[PDB]
Amino acid sequence: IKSALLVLEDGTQFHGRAIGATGSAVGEVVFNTSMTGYQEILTDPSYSRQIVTLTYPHIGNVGTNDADEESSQVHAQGLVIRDLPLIASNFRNTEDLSSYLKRHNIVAIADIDTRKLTRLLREKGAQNGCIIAGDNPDAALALEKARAFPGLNGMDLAKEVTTAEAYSWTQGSWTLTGGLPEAKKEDELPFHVVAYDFGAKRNILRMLVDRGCRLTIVPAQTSAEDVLKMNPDGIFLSNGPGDPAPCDYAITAIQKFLETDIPVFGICLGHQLLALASGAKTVKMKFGHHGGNHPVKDVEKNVVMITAQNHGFAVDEATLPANLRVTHKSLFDGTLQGIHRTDKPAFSFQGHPEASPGPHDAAPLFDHFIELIEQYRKT
Amino acid sequence: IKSALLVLEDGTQFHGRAIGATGSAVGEVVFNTSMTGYQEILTDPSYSRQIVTLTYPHIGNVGTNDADEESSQVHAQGLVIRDLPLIASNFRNTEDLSSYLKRHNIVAIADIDTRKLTRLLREKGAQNGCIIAGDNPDAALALEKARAFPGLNGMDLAKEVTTAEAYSWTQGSWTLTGGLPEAKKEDELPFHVVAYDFGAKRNILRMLVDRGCRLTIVPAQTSAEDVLKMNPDGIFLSNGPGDPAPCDYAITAIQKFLETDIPVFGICLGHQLLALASGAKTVKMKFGHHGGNHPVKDVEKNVVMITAQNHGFAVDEATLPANLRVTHKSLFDGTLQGIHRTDKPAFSFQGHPEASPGPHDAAPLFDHFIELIEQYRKT
Amino acid sequence: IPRFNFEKFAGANDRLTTQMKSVGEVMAIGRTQQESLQKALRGLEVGATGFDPKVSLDDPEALTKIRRELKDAGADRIWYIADAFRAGLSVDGVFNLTNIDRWFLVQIEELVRLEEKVAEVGITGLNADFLRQLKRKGFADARLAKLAGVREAEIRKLRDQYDLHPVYKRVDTCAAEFATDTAYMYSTYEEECEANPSTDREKIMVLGGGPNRIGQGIEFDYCCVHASLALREDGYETIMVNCNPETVSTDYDTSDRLYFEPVTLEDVLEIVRIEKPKGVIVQYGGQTPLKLARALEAAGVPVIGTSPDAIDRAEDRERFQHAVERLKLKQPANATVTAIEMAVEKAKEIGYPLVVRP
Amino acid sequence: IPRFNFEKFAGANDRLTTQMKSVGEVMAIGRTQQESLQKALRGLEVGATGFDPKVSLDDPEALTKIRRELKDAGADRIWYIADAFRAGLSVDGVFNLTNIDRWFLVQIEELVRLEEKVAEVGITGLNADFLRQLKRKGFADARLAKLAGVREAEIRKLRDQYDLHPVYKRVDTCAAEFATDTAYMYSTYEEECEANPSTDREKIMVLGGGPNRIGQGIEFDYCCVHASLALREDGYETIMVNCNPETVSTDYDTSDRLYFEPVTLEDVLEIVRIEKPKGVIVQYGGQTPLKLARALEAAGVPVIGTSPDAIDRAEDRERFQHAVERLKLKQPANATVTAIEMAVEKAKEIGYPLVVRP
Ligand SMILES: [Cl-]
Ligand SMILES: [Cl-]
Ligand SMILES: [Cl-]
Ligand SMILES: [Cl-]
Ligand SMILES: [K+]
Ligand SMILES: [K+]
C-alpha cells in the first residue's frame, strides 16, 4: 500500500494511491478533458507549476514514447488520475506510465474522484493544491504547502522555462510511416523565422518547418534589436506558462517589432503578449480552458473549429484597441480566441493550432502566417 | 541491451550485463565461494571498498529480505556474478536482487566468466578493478580507475564505517518461527559488554545478546579510558574492512585494556587488532579467505570446524609473542586462525563465529568468552 | 454487450461471425472499464451476476472446451475467458486465441484473481476495506455471495452495515466542464453523490426490461414509455430504470429522471434507497422486472398495480388451477408427472395429443 | 534426469510415484541451470535433443493431454512442461499442477520463448551473437536444426564458421579456490578453456553408453572401463567420454582424462576437435556409441577397431543375408513384406511359426 494524498487550498482532501515519485508537489490544480494525449499534455511547458487532473478515468492505456514529448521534460507539477491501467497496450509504447513518471520524478496520485474534483474546480474556480506521496501523508502539511503557494496570478513563468542560449530548429513533423524525420538542412528551408521561447512546444516548431521555415529559437528576454539584426522573415511568439502580464521584456520587444513591417504571429501565451503590446489587457480565468474538444468560431468565415486548449488567462475583448480586430471566439463561453492587427502583419490565436494532442482543425492558422511572410519577402 | 564492464589492474577485461545501478565502481576484487548467503555477504561492512565476485553461478535465487542484512547498508563496492536468475523463488523474499541492487545504488555485472576471474585472482593474487555499467562502457577509463585505486594495504577503513556516536544493542537472533526478535530490555541481560565498532556485523551482536550480553556499541576510535569508565563485563572487538595495521587508536587502547583483567575477545579485524596490540605482526594475504566451507583446526582439541571466512590480512604466526598462544589454524593453508593470551583473559578468532552466512561450527567461540566474563564477575 | 437467442434455434450455427445473429444489446456505464463491464454482465438478463464459471475446475476436459470457445467465439466467449484464467491460461495465450486486446484481458484476469481471494477468505474476509475495493471493480452482491457461500442479501446487508453504497454521477457530454439540469445518471462507488433527489414531488418508478430478446421486445418498452409519458403529464415525477441503449425508454427526454442501470434487485434497491418513490411499476417491462416484484416488495419496495402475489397466483400453475376451479371455468385436462411411466398413465388419463411443459 | 523403460512393460502403470520405476540415470554439468538441464536432456539417450514437443500445436485436444501429463507425472513430464508453455499455459498454471518450483519453471519457459524466436528467424536469423546466446543456454545443434528446418550439420557448420566452440572447465571440489592436477572436465560456452590437452602422448578415446536402460547395462560400461585401464597400462593416454553418474567409467581414477559429457555427435566432435586422438573406440558402449560410428568417421574421426561399414554390414538385415549367403551358411527362412496380404502369402512360403520383426 503506497499512499498519496491531495489537498486543496480550501482544505478539500483526496485520498489515493501513489503512482509516481515519492514526495510532494505544489501548484495550481487544473482539469483537462482530453481523452487522449496524456504524455503530450504532461510535457507541455505551459503546465509549469500546475498540477494536472485528467477527466478521462484511464490514463496510461498506451504507455509512453519519445515522439510524444512536447518538450525535453515533464513540466507538469503533478498528475491526478482516476485509474492507472494495469498495462500499456500500444505498439508505440516504450515505457509504462508509472515508470515514466517515476523516471521524470513526478509526484502523482491515482484512484481519486477526479469527477468530484473537476466539478469543484469548475464551480469554485482554480485552486492551488498539494500532493503528498509517501508512507504517511500529512494532511496538515499538505494544506499548509497548498495555502503557502504564491499563485500563478502575476507569476512570470516564461522566464523560467525558456532556453539558455539561442538555437536552430529544422525539424519537421512525425508520420506514422516515417516517425520523426531527420532535421532539414538549413539551405533546404525557404523562410527564416525567429521564435521566442516562452516555453515553446516542439509541435509548433515542427509545424513551421513543415511549412518551409528554418528556425532560430531565442531566449524569452531577447531584445528586439538583437532579433532585427537577424533579418527575420517573420517573428514567432510561442506558448508558455504563467501570467503574460509581468513579461515586460517581451511586451516591449514586441512593440518594437510592431513598428516594423515584419510579420508577427503568436500562439497562446504569445497571443496574450501580442495583445498587451497592442494595448489591451489580460485577465485570469475562473478555471480556464484545458481540453481538446473546444469549439471556436472564425467569426469572419462563420465556421467552427474543434480546438486544443491550454490557457488560464485571457485577453479581455472589452479593452481591445481598435488596431486590434476580433478574429476568433470561444463557442463554449464567448471568450476571446483570435486577433489581427488592422494596421500590421500581426495576428495571434489563443488555443493551439499545433494541437498535439488534439484536433488538427486550427492548423491553417499557420498558413496565414506564411502568407504574410511570402508577401513580406515580396517586399 | 544494458552493458557492463569489468576491468582489472592488469588490464584483463570482462564484458557483461548490467544488473544494478548505472555507473562505475572501483576497489579490490575478491572472490567468495559461498553457494548461499549472498545478501548477508553484500551487507558485510568488511567488504567496504571491495568488488565481490561470487563463484556460485546463480545469485539471487531467493531474492532479498531485511532479516538477511548484516548492516544498515550494502558495503560491497560492486558485485560480479555469472547469472542473475529470472526470478527470486523463496517465501522469505521481499525484493528481487536486481531491484535491491539498484535501490542500494550498487554497480553490478552479470554474465561473465567468474571462473576465469577466480582462477586469475587465485593464481596472481588480489587485484584492484573497476566495473563500469552504462550505455557504452569505456574500458580505458575503467582501467585508469582500477589502476588509480590506492589499494587496501595500509588503508584504515574501520574509522570509515564506524558509528559516529555510541549506542546500545539488545536485539538477539532470528528464528524461522519468530523472525527477528524485539530488542530485549536491559534488565533482561545479565552482562554488559562494550563492543568496538570497526564495521561490526549484526549477527555478532545478536549472538552476544543471545548469550546474555547487553551491548554498548562504541566508535572505533573510542579511548580505553572512556570505556573503562563504563565498567564493562567484557570488551568486544568487531570485524571490519581494510588493514588492521594503521588503526593506531585501537591498538593503543587495547594495550590498555590488556593491563586490566577485563576479558577481551576479538573476531576477524579484532583478532588482528588484538595480535598487533600484543606485539605481533599482520600481513596482507595473496588472495585471502572468503567462503563458508573453510576448515579450521582447534589445535588444542584436535577438532575441525567448517567456517565462514572473510579476510585479506592475517597474523604472522612466526612473529607471535610468547604471551600469544596459537589456538587455531586453517586446514586449507596452515595460516593463523586463533590465539589466546597466556597471561590475560584475552582471545580472538580470525573467522566469523557468528557466520551469517555459513556454518554454525564456530559459534562455541562465543561461549568461551562468556566463561571469562562470568569468572570475571566472580571476582 | 450483445444479447443472443441461440437456445431458441437448436439447429443453428452459434459461432460468431460477420453476419449479425444477436437479438438485442445492453449497455452499462462505469467509472472504470472493469466496473463498466461487470455492470453490463449483470444487466444482460442471462442469469449472469458477472463472470460466472462455465466449466468446472476439476473437469479434465475443461481446457479443451475453453480453448475451442476462445478460438471460435460464440455468445459465451466472455465467460470462457475468465474460465481460461482460472484454469491457468496466460493473457498471451488468451490473446493468441482471441485476438482481444491485452489491455482488456488483463482486467478480466485481475477480476479473476480477486474472485479467488474472496473465495478463499469467505464472508469473514470481507472487511469494509476490501468489500469496497470489490464494489469499485463492479462486483455484484450476487457474485460475491456465490464466492463466499452466502445469500446475496447477506452481502447486501453487509454493505448496509459498512454503509457501503454507490454514488450517482451524471451524463453531461462534457466531462463536468459544464453544469447540467438533466437527470441522466449511473451508479459508481465513488465519493461525491450527484443524485440530488427531490423531496418535492410524489415519484413514480418504471422498471424497464433490459436488453431485448425474443419474447421480450419493444412492445414492453413501448408500455414502459407510456407509463412514463402519462404519469408525468399527470404531474408525477417519473423515474425510469433501464439499460437498453436501443430504446425510447433510455432517452433522457422520456422521463424526469433516468437511471441507466442494470434492472436488478441490487441496482434497483439502491435507487429506491435514495429516491424513496411513492410507487414502483414492475408489470410493464416484461419478464425482467416481473421476476423482481416479490423480492422488491419484501425489501419494502412500494410496488404499485397488481401485487406480486396476485401475479404469482396467475403464474403458478397450481395457484391458478385452483382459482379457475373456484370460478368454475374450462381448463384443459392437466397432470404433473415426475416419472416417465407415471406420465404414460397420467397421459392415458388426460388424452392425446399432449402438451408437455417443463 | 532419470531414465525409464516403460515401453518394455506395456501393461504397467507408467505414472511416477514413491516406488522407483527408473532403470538408470544421466547426469550433466553446466555453468547455468539451463545449460545443465539441456545438456542432460540430450544425453538421456531417448531421442531428445532438448525440449522436443510431444503434442502438436494444432491439436485441439492438446491442452487436455498436456494437463493430464503435468498433473500426474509420467516419464515424459519434462517435455509436456514446455509443451504447456508453447500452448499458452502460464508458469503459475504449470506450478499448480506440478508443484515444480517456479524457479525452475521460469527457466523452461524462457527456453520455449527462445525456441519461438529461432523458429521465426530461421537459419538466417542465426547470427553469431544469437547463436552464441543459444549455445550458452545449452541448446543442441540438433534442436536448433529442427527449429530452423535444416540438418544438424548445418548448425554445426555455422558454429565452425563463427568459431563458436565450447570451452572445458574442470571439477575441483572447491570453486577454483585451489588448483587441480586432475582432468575431470565438462563443456560450457564460456571464455577461458581449461582442457589443455597434451601433445605428448598417443591418445585413445573410449565412448560410454550414457545412462543405463534395459539391454544397455553395466556390462557395456565394464567393457568401457577395461579398455581404459588396459590401454592406459600399455602407456596410452586414455580419454573417457560418458555421462552416467552411477558407473566406474565416470570415476576420475579410471582414465587419464574424463569428459563428463553427453555421448552425442555434437559433444564428441568438440572433444575430438581439441584432443585430436589417435583413435576412438565406439564398439564398447552399447548402442549409443555404435549409432554414432558412421557420423564420426565421416566427420573425420579416427574410429579404431571394426569399421563402421562392417558393423553396418552385420546390422543390416539385407547386407547380412548377402554375406551369410556368400559363406554358404544356414539362415532361417525370411521375407520382407510391405502389406498384410503380402505377408500372408509370404508366410505361406516361409512357414509357421513366424517371427515378426519391426
Ligand atoms: Cl477522492
Ligand atoms: Cl484577473
Ligand atoms: Cl568474461
Ligand atoms: Cl604485507
Ligand atoms: K480513493
Ligand atoms: K559475457
Query: Same domain, yes or no, for C138 and C164?
Result: yes
Q: CA A24 to CA A16: how far, in whole Å?
A: 14
Helix, strand, coil tally for chain A in percent (to 5): 25, 30, 40
Nearest CA among D275, D268, D254 for reference residue D202: D275
B267 contacts B352 by C-beta, under 8 angstroms: yes
Ramachandran sector of residue B132 (left: φ over 0; alpha: ψ -120 to 50; beta: rest): beta
Query: How many CB pairs (< 8 A) connect B and D?
Result: 56
Query: Same domain, yes or no, for B159 and B61?
Result: no
Nearest CA among A342, A344, A364 for reference residue A353: A364
Q: CA B309 to CA A138: how far, in whole Å?
A: 47
Ramachandran sector of residue C134 (left: φ over 0; alpha: ψ -120 to 50; beta: rest): alpha
List B27's β-bridge partners, or say none. B129
User: Catalytic one among A130, A213, A247, A268?
Assistant: A268
Q: CA D355 to CA D358: how far, in whole Å?
A: 10
Query: Same domain, yes or no, for A156 and A143?
Result: no
List C86's β-bridge partners, or say none. none
Ligand 6 centre and the CA of B109: distance in Å?
10
Query: Same domain, yes or no, for B131 and B181?
Result: no
Using CA coordinates, name the residue in chain B closest to D133. B111
Minimal Cα–Cα distance from D161 to chain C, Å? 37
Ligand 6 centre and the CA of B102: distance in Å?
21
- Secondary structure, 3-state, chain D: CEECCHHHCCCCCCCCCCCCCCCEECCCCCCCHHHHHHHHHHHCCCCCCCCCCCCCCCCCCHHHHHHHHHHCCCCCHHHHHHHHHHCCECHHHHHHHHCCCHHHHHHHHHHHHHHHHHHHHCHHHCCHHHHHHHHHCCCCHHHHHHHHCCCHHHHHHHHHHHCCCCEEEECCCCCCCCCCCCCEEEEECCCCCCCCCCCCCCEEEEECCCCCECCECHHHHHHHHHHHHHHHHCCCEEEEEECCCCCHHHCHHHCCEEEECCCCHHHHHHHHHHHCCCEEECCCCCHHHHHHHHHHHHCCCCEECCCHHHHHHHHCHHHHHHHHHHCCCCCCCCCCCCCHHHHHHHHHHHCCCCCCCC
Ligand 4 centre and the CA of B315: distance in Å?
10
- The angle that helices C77-86 and C62-71 make with each other, rounded to 10 degrees, is 140
Please name the residues between 72 and 111 in chain C that touch chain D, using a CB distance below 8 Å.
87-90, 92-94, 96-97
Cell numbers of B159, please?
574509522
Ligand 3 centre and the CA of D195: distance in Å?
17
Minimal Cα–Cα distance from D174 to chain B, Å? 8
Helix, strand, coil tally for chain B in percent (to 5): 25, 30, 40
H/E segment holding residue B309: strand B303-315
Q: CA A83 to CA A251: how far, in whole Å?
A: 42
Q: CA B114 to CA B111: how far, in whole Å?
A: 8
Q: CA B250 to CA B271: how far, in whole Å?
A: 12
What is the CA C322 to chain-centroid distance, rounded? Answer: 32
Long-range pairs, D176-182, Cβ under 8 A, ≥24? D176/B31, D176/B55, D176/B115, D176/B118, D176/B119, D176/B122, D177/B31, D177/B33, D177/B55, D177/B118, D177/B122, D177/B291, D177/B332, D178/B122, D178/B332, D179/B122, D179/B123, D182/D252
Query: Same domain, yes or no, for C145 and C276?
Result: no
Number of alpha carbons in the 13 Å side-chain half-sphere of residue B64: 23
- The angle that helices D77-86 and D62-71 make with each other, rounded to 10 degrees, is 140
Query: Same domain, yes or no, for D63 and D174?
Result: yes
Judging contacts by C-beta atoms under 8 Å, the chain C residues touching residue A89 are 101-103
Q: CA A326 to CA A116: how far, in whole Å?
A: 36
Q: Which ligand is located closest to the Cα atom of residue A245?
A: 2
Q: Other CB atoms closer than 10 Å to residue B179's CB: what's the count?
A: 11
Pairwise CB contact (< 8 Å): A118 & C192: no
B80 contacts B109 by C-beta, under 8 angstroms: yes
Catalytic site residue B268? yes
Contacting residues for A301 by C-beta, under 8 A, at least 6 apart: none
Q: Please identify, among A150, A173, A204, the residue that sits at the C-terminal boundary of a domain.
A: A150
**Residue C64 forms contact with D (CB below 8 Å):** yes
Query: Same domain, yes or no, for A69 and A160?
Result: no
Number of alpha carbons in the 13 Å side-chain half-sphere of residue B101: 27
Q: Please identify, among B118, B150, B182, the residue that sits at the C-terminal boundary of a domain.
A: B150
Q: In this structure, are strands B324-330 and B282-298 parallel, antiparallel, or unpaired?
A: antiparallel
- Please tell me whether residue A108 adopts helix, strand or coil conformation: strand
What is the residue whose three cell numbers read 576448515?
Answer: B295
Q: Please identify, among A113, A135, A150, the residue that sits at the C-terminal boundary of a domain.
A: A150
Ligand 6 centre and the CA of C188: distance in Å?
54
Pairwise CB contact (< 8 Å): B291 & D177: yes
Pairwise CB contact (< 8 Å): B115 & D190: yes
Nearest CA among B161, B29, B51 for reference residue B106: B51
Cell numbers of D329, please?
551358411
H/E segment holding residue C138: none
Judging contacts by C-beta atoms under 8 Å, the chain D residues touching residue B55 are 175-177
Residue type, B213: C
Question: Number of structural domains, chain B?
Answer: 2
User: Catalytic one among A9, A40, A70, A354?
Assistant: A354
Looking at residue B149, the DSSP 8-state letter turns out to be -
Query: What is the largest distance, in Å, between two alpha-carbon atoms of chain A?
Result: 67
Number of alpha carbons in the 13 Å side-chain half-sphere of residue C78: 19
Judging contacts by C-beta atoms under 8 Å, the chain C residues touching residue A122 are 176-179
Q: CA A80 to CA D174: how far, in whole Å?
A: 57
Judging contacts by C-beta atoms under 8 Å, the chain D residues touching residue C67 are 60, 63
- Please tell me whether residue C353 adopts helix, strand or coil conformation: coil
Query: Same domain, yes or no, for D157 and D233?
Result: no
Distance (Å) of CA C13 to CA C8, C44, C73: 12, 22, 11
Query: Same domain, yes or no, for A127 and A195?
Result: no
Query: Same domain, yes or no, for A277 and A373?
Result: yes
**Residue B115 forms contact with D (CB below 8 Å):** yes
Residue type, A168: S
- Structural domain of residue A291, as residue ranges? 151-378
**Residue C68 forms contact with D (CB below 8 Å):** yes
Q: Which chains does A contact via 3+ CB–CB distances below 8 A? A: C
Number of alpha carbons in the 13 Å side-chain half-sphere of residue A319: 13
Nearest CA among A364, A176, A200, A195 for reference residue A268: A200
Straight-line distance from the first to the last Cα atom of chain B, in angstroms, rounded to the nearest whole number: 67
Cell numbers of D93, please?
498454471
Query: Same domain, yes or no, for B174 and B275?
Result: yes
D187 contacts D195 by C-beta, under 8 angstroms: no
Query: Same domain, yes or no, for C284 and C217?
Result: yes
Query: Same domain, yes or no, for D129 and D258?
Result: no
- Structural domain of residue C187, as residue ranges? 46-195
Pairwise CB contact (< 8 Å): D176 & B291: no
DSSP letters of B174-188?
Answer: -BTTTBSPPPPPGGG
A173 contacts A60 by C-beta, under 8 angstroms: no
CATH number where D122 lies: 1.10.1030.10
Cell numbers of C140, please?
455484484
Q: Which ligand is located closest to the Cα atom of residue D191?
A: 3
Pairwise CB contact (< 8 Å): C176 & A83: no
Straight-line distance from the first to the last Cα atom of chain D, in angstroms, rounded to the nearest whole number: 29
Distance (Å) of CA B217 to CA B203, B204, B230, B271, D316: 14, 12, 12, 18, 83
Query: Same domain, yes or no, for A146 and A160?
Result: no
Query: Same domain, yes or no, for C257 and C182?
Result: no
**Residue C307 forms contact with D (CB below 8 Å):** no
Ligand 1 centre and the CA of A54: distance in Å?
14
Nearest CA among B143, B144, B114, B140 for reference residue B17: B114
Pairwise CB contact (< 8 Å): B115 & D169: yes
- Please tell me whether residue C84 adopts helix, strand or coil conformation: helix
B170 contacts B216 by C-beta, under 8 angstroms: no
Query: Same domain, yes or no, for B115 and B253?
Result: no
Query: Same domain, yes or no, for A213 and A278?
Result: yes
Q: CA C62 to CA C54: how far, in whole Å?
A: 9
Query: Same domain, yes or no, for C182 and C51?
Result: yes
Pairwise CB contact (< 8 Å): D96 & C88: yes
Catalytic site residue A247? no
Judging contacts by C-beta atoms under 8 Å, the chain C residues touching residue A293 are 174
Q: Do chains C and A touch (3 or more CB pairs under 8 A)?
A: yes
Minimal Cα–Cα distance from D104 to chain C, Å? 18
**Residue D171 forms contact with C (CB below 8 Å):** no
Query: Same domain, yes or no, for D185 and D57?
Result: yes
Ligand 3 centre and the CA of B15: distance in Å?
5
Please name the residues between 189 and 208 in chain C that touch chain A, using a CB distance below 8 Å.
190-192
CATH number where D223 lies: 3.40.50.20
Query: Same domain, yes or no, for A232 and A198?
Result: yes
Q: Among A36, A83, A86, A93, pick the best mutation site for testing chain C contact (most C Cβ within 10 A).
A: A86
H/E segment holding residue C155: helix C152-161
**Per residue in B200-216, is it b (16+ CB within 10 Å) or e — as a string?**
bbbbbbbbbbebbbbbb
- Please tell me whether residue C225 adopts helix, strand or coil conformation: helix
CATH number where A141 lies: 3.50.30.20
Cell numbers of B91, please?
517465501
Catalytic site residue B144? no
Pairwise CB contact (< 8 Å): C107 & A56: no
Q: CA C40 to CA C34: how far, in whole Å?
A: 10
H/E segment holding residue C60: none
Q: CA D12 to CA D75: how far, in whole Å?
A: 13
Judging contacts by C-beta atoms under 8 Å, the chain D residues touching residue B123 are 179
Ligand 4 centre and the CA of D227: distance in Å?
52
Q: CA B254 to CA B274: how far, in whole Å?
A: 7
List C280's β-bridge partners, or say none. C205, C303
Judging contacts by C-beta atoms under 8 Å, the chain D residues touching residue C72 are none
Q: Which chains does B contact via 3+ CB–CB distances below 8 A? A: D
Query: Same domain, yes or no, for D183 and D51?
Result: yes
User: Catalytic one among B268, B271, B294, B328?
Assistant: B268
What is the CA D50 to chain-centroid distance, rounded? Answer: 9
Judging contacts by C-beta atoms under 8 Å, the chain B residues touching residue D190 are 113, 115-116
Q: What are phi and psi of A139, to 5 degrees?
A: -65, -35
Using CA coordinates, name the residue in chain A closest to C189. A113
Query: Same domain, yes or no, for B39 and B133?
Result: yes
Query: Same domain, yes or no, for C269 and C300?
Result: yes
Query: Same domain, yes or no, for C148 and C161?
Result: yes
- Please tell me whether residue C301 adopts helix, strand or coil conformation: coil
Residue type, A61: N
Q: CA B379 to CA D302: how far, in whole Å?
A: 83
Distance (Å) of CA A3 to CA A116, A137, C332: 20, 7, 70
After which residues, if any, is chain B broken (C to N > 2.5 Å)?
none
Using CA coordinates, name the residue in chain D closest to C96. D88
Cell numbers of D277, please?
586422438
Q: CA C85 to CA C102: how far, in whole Å?
A: 13
